[PDB]
Amino acid sequence: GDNRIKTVVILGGGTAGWMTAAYLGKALQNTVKIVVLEAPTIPRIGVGEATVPNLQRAFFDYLGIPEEEWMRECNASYKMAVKFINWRTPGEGSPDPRTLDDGHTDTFHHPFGLLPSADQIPLSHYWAAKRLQGETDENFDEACFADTAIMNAKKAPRFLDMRRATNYAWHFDASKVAAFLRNFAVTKQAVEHVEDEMTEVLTDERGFITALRTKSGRILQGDLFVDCSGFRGLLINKAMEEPFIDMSDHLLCNSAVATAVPHDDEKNGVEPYTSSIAMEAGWTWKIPMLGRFGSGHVYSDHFATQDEATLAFSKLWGLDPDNTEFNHVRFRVGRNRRAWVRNCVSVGLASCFVEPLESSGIYFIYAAIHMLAKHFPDKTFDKVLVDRFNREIEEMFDDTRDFLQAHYYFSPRVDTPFWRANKELKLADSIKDKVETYRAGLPVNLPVTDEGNFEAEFRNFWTNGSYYCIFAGLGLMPRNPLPALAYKPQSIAEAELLFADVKRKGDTLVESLPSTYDLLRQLHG
Amino acid sequence: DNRIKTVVILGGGTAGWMTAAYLGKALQNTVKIVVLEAPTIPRIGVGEATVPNLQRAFFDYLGIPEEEWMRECNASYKMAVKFINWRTPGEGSPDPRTLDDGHTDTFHHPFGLLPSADQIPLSHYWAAKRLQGETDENFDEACFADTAIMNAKKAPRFLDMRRATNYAWHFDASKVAAFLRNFAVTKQAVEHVEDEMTEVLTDERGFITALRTKSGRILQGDLFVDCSGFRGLLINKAMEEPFIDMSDHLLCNSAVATAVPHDDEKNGVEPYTSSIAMEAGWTWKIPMLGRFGSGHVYSDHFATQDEATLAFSKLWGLDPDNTEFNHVRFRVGRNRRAWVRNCVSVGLASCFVEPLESSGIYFIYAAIHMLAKHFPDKTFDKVLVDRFNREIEEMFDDTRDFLQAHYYFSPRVDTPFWRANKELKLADSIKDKVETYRAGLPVNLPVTDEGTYYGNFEAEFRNFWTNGSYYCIFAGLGLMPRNPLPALAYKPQSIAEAELLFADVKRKGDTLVESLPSTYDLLRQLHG
Ligand SMILES: N[C@H](Cc1c[nH]c2ccccc12)C(=O)O
């Protein structure tokens, strides 16, 4: 016979909806009808969104969409790191770094370049040895990644002839990526765009969804439903009654106030990185694009009111707190008990969320979509397929939640009740174990690759290098060097050449590369 | 200077001399290394099998070329373990019985990673075709050109030594030990003390300060490696670390072995290890130039040594009185902790399973590799020790589980041995993987190419038994998924892309089965 899914209905557009539609369009090879039900788009100012480097490999390449093509259509810029500003020093927010007890600037980078090795030990470990033994005054980021010097000079990750210099991710307008993908899905993949509100969810006797009724009275029948409805979870939470697990016992931020800020890219150039600017009750992103930069103060409302937060946010950029356009979001932090129940699959905010401290939102969507295609059911909805999908989403999420918690728990700051309450939170066992490992001088989640394949990154997402960037950046160091280094003088010496190579290539590239500004100007024909 | 200054290794053989040689290179002559070994009573070379990383991870680390060590220990090539009669009842025989469905009862467990189409391994396209009647081909022959190369007994290299395929090694264990002793003493300033141990001297915390020899000499050290074999003279006896018996997971606990002269002119040489099923266990065959090692592994709760020796002798038609037999009674399991205080267990002193999937040398290499990475100073940081212990326990339990799957999913129920296998519990870890397989999903999908996998030990160690190895054993024993992977029902272009991969396997197999020398002719050239 034929027990296959025939129709898929996706509730909600935006990134989650149109990413799911486009990806399933390619994955299911036109054997399945795909419908997107999206309420017509109330226009909101492009507050900017940041990504991680596998986005082109895991998503746009699967779809056959060249990098330059999609960037041109959504005002995209380059990202070589997240730069953390004032995460160690007390007081009011400021774009400018305060000065540490030891005299150095309170800035550290989390770049995506992965670290070379000598004698199967990463350069991280040789740096740590020299720092703990007084043989260097260099920061981890400066010693270990040429990317740090390239970002300090605001240079581009590519040459004008488009040769790659370094690894990088992307800044873009979310609503314009959604628009680009809608058009691609509708014109290239026979996806049906239904512009209407949902009013009823029709369910059979055993609790499966049979169809969505729209305002216009159209009945969208389907065998499988993707909830991309955002925080409301119109299908997964409301209709299906799957509980959401709040994880404010792990992260405190639960609110943001955002906007977009015109920018003199002639004077200042463009920063090829996202900035995480510390504040009293949370932090503030800055996502440079050609002509402006998106920003949003992420805060806990148990430690600041919306007005306190809006004032503090406005003060930061020196904006008129009444006559500038603000978007105010109150978000869920956590995940559904189960991402997929019966014939309902949650993707995006409907599934899970953390604050965008390490740009995890788009990644969560393409990872979930990738796992849906791999676990794609027939009408029997085998419980093992569903359970293994749910297992992958919970491990993906908890991994990134824990990484983020490490950013708060190991901040030295104690000046406001927010920063103090961070130290009151329990750490998940998983991240206590990794702290203990790091503190003994051992690597955490050693990377295995030279490519810098989505599947390799998904199983080991936050590698040794990323733990060092955050731990060492916040001032947490191992108790001692890796003991094996005391027996390996030849390896120490081999590592000295690697540090020299980082210095040389940093200097060579800081001279030969165009500015982010000049590459963007060339790109946006 | 709080560093370890001296390392004392109790015991030689493979575990002792591999540890000595590896630490010699790893510690860059900043540390004194002593091997205390009782002088060597010669024993029959019953043969040992290995995995492919051994040349890259060990001999190449030491700068020893492949041809050099193979020539010194009568080594041959290995492209798989071949399982014979694991599905059909009756007495042991070298020759495969026939299944109810007409297939011969042989299946291969070769090396390499399976190619993919649309991020789905070739295993899954094969399974679809088999469950849907579109193929009568075995998993092994559809999915690995190596199966055809092994069927013709051809070599994994051409005579000019171009690589054709993946492979590992058969060798004489005692000759590899001898080769490495000589290398460690003459090239790495290791001190060989030929004496028995009489005393283990300890401080107030129970840390070892020195070993007394029979001659009365006192070997001081800061770190002790127990390579003493099953007796665990340091880890179990002196340190009193309990051994966890795991006969509630595997039943075999005995072996009777020997070496068998072989007409390599008539029969050629098999470039693989054979696992020949018997009534109370199984029998290895490890071909080398001129002879083959063999040993019947058995449970003594289901056969006596006589029963086992007779049955083993019957198999090859050996004279059960006038052939030389080695009789081993082994412990199966691992220490509660591999490393206690300043005592590190390696080899049989740490852990054992029967050599059903050639895990002996690998267990040694992995422990040695992890010792160098976790190498302490005199403060013996408990986190270094704990992380070492965690790696060895997970390594062992993973392979114990994989091995149990060989017995639990054998369809055989004809003897009380095969029946008792099905009375044992499966560990959770392996139940979960069976359930995943049975829904058509991959188990332990490889995440790197072959270059990375066999080039960086850390990539192999985190993914040792891949999707391919689960299919080789499950499908080989006749456990199949309930249904194909549902995603495949929506992916006709991907089905078609997989058909080209099957065609590529056929072409490579046929091209190479014609152009390659016999294992015999490559061995003849190698041992010139
Ligand atoms: N890591 C795997 C182990 C392996 C694969 N096939 C066999 C056959 C016999 C023993 C071990 C293995 C590899 O080497 O590819």
UniProtKB/Swiss-Prot annotation, chain B:
Effect of loss of the gene: Deletion mutant cannot produce thienodolin. Thienodolin production is restored when the mutant is cultured in the presence of 6-chloro-tryptophan.
Binding locations of L-tryptophan: 110, 453-454, 460, 464
Catalytic class of the enzyme: oxidoreductase
Active-site annotation: 78
Binding site for FAD: 12, 14-15, 38, 41, 44, 46, 49, 197, 348, 361
Chain positions of site Important for activity: 357
Reactions accelerated catalytically: L-tryptophan + FADH2 + chloride + O2 = 6-chloro-L-tryptophan + FAD + 2 H2O; D-tryptophan + FADH2 + chloride + O2 = 6-chloro-D-tryptophan + FAD + 2 H2O
Outcome of swapping residue 81 to I: In Thal-RebH5; regioselectivity of chlorination and bromination is almost completely switched from C6 to C7
GO molecular function, one term: nucleotide binding
Top-rank taxon: Bacteria
Positions bound to chloride: 359-360
Recorded family membership: Belongs to the flavin-dependent halogenase family. Bacterial tryptophan halogenase subfamily.
Identification of the protein by name: Tryptophan 6-halogenase ThaL
Gene name of this polypeptide: thaL
